[PDB]
């Protein structure tokens, strides 16, 4: 056929070692630009004035960081939510000072990862698969959108997006707890049940299937060689795993249908992480965790502290120290 | 930065020794 049909057929080829696809056509350049910029800024970027107060934070290895302390630093509070491409700076020197790399990285990354999601759907279509892997991936993607995009929107500044760094991430979590009491928020409690329960069920299923592997090997070889790739039959006795697990608890707390069991494995963490992503995304609009400060009082009206009041003493320490030079007026309203 | 100068050798042996162990086992595997 003609040129454009050759190109189309290559793009959507199921014979390429890595699938490209139409989503891939956007994903590849945006992920490459994000990765290249991120690697160079992490190693060599000069200090960034994150809070807009002419107090630059050093985030790169060459300016005194290690792997744990380093980061790509969010762009200046002075910028807020304004778009700050390279071409809007008078010079690269200005762009680096005000944190331009952060914007470039997050935008190319949010776009690339969104297309990574679409690319998962796209290949599943070309292979004849059911299509909902990409739904599962939407839980982590939405999480990323929350800390890098939504939360800056609600608060008015990319200076309050999550930093690209190990310690930067901790910084973000601590300040979040003081400003929103996320620990007392049900959606983050749902997220913790999501991931603890994911881990638990992960270990459970691995241990249960591993426990019922069919003897196909000797004791001097890896049990793993009892399974051959593409083999017709199952390599474990699911009836036996149910028999074990049904007795460990009781017969109906246990799954004997493989399809129902694996759907539960998918849904538990995905839902829970949807909820914690929705939790960041709504604390972005200052609907915060439950507040039980001074919620118990005695017959006279003395405050009788609870554990919520002790949490609040901690929150208050975080509140009054963070960004110690950045507040001139007594309420920290964003 | 006033870092621990025994850190370079600790990091280097931390990588080299176990990695060499793996490589030795893998290569003698591929040749039998």
């Amino acid at each position: 056929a003609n040129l454009w049909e050759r190109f189309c057929n290559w793009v959507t080829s199921t014979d390429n070692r890595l699938y490209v696809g139409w989503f891939g056509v956007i994903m590849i350049p945006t992920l490459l630009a994000a990765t290249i910029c991120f690697v160079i800024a992490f190693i060599a970027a000069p200090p960034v004035d994150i809070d807009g107060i002419r107090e630059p934070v050093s985030g790169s290895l060459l300016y005194g960081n290690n792997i744990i302390t380093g980061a790509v630093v969010p762009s200046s509070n002075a910028i807020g939510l304004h778009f700050y491409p390279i071409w809007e700076a008078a010079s690269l020197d200005e762009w680096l000072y005000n944190g331009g790399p952060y914007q470039l990285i997050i935008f190319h990354f949010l776009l690339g990862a969104s297309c990574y999601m679409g690319r998962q759907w796209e290949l599943s279509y070309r292979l004849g698969m059911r299509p909902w892997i990409c739904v599962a991936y939407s839980a982590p993607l939405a999480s990323a959108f929350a800390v890098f995009l939504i939360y800056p929107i609600g608060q008015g500044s990319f200076s309050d997006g999550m930093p690209l760094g190990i310690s930067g991430t901790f910084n973000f979590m601590i300040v979040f707890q003081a400003e929103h009491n996320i620990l007392m928020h049900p959606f983050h409690q749902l997220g913790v049940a999501g991931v603890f329960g994911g881990a638990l069920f992960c270990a459970m299923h691995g241990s249960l299937v591993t426990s019922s592997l069919i003897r196909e090997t000797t004791e001097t070889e890896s049990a793993n060689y009892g399974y051959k790739f593409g083999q017709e039959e199952e390599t474990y006795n699911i009836v036996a795993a149910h028999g074990y697990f049904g007795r460990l608890i009781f017969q109906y707390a246990s799954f004997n249908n493989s399809r129902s069991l694996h759907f539960f494995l998918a849904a538990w963490p995905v839902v829970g992480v949807w909820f914690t992503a929705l939790g960041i995304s709504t604390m972005a609009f200052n609907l915060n965790g439950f507040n039980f400060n001074h919620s118990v009082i005695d017959a006279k009206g003395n405050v009788i502290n609870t554990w919520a009041d002790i949490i609040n003493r901690a929150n208050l320490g975080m509140e009054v120290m963070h960004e110690r030079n950045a507040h001139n007026f007594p309420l920290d309203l964003a | 930065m006033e870092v621990n100068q025994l850190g370079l050798i600790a990091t280097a042996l931390f990588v080299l020794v176990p990695s060499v162990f793996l490589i030795i086992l893998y290569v003698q595997t591929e040749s039998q």
Binding site: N66, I67, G230, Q231 | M1, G7, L8, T11, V15
Partner: peptide
Amino acid sequence: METITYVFIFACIIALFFFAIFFREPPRIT
């Protein structure tokens, strides 16, 4: 020296990624 070291290790991982993908044990249907 510390910067060089972190970058070296990161660089080795990226090279590992390349071999683990393109020079993997190919899966076959035994």
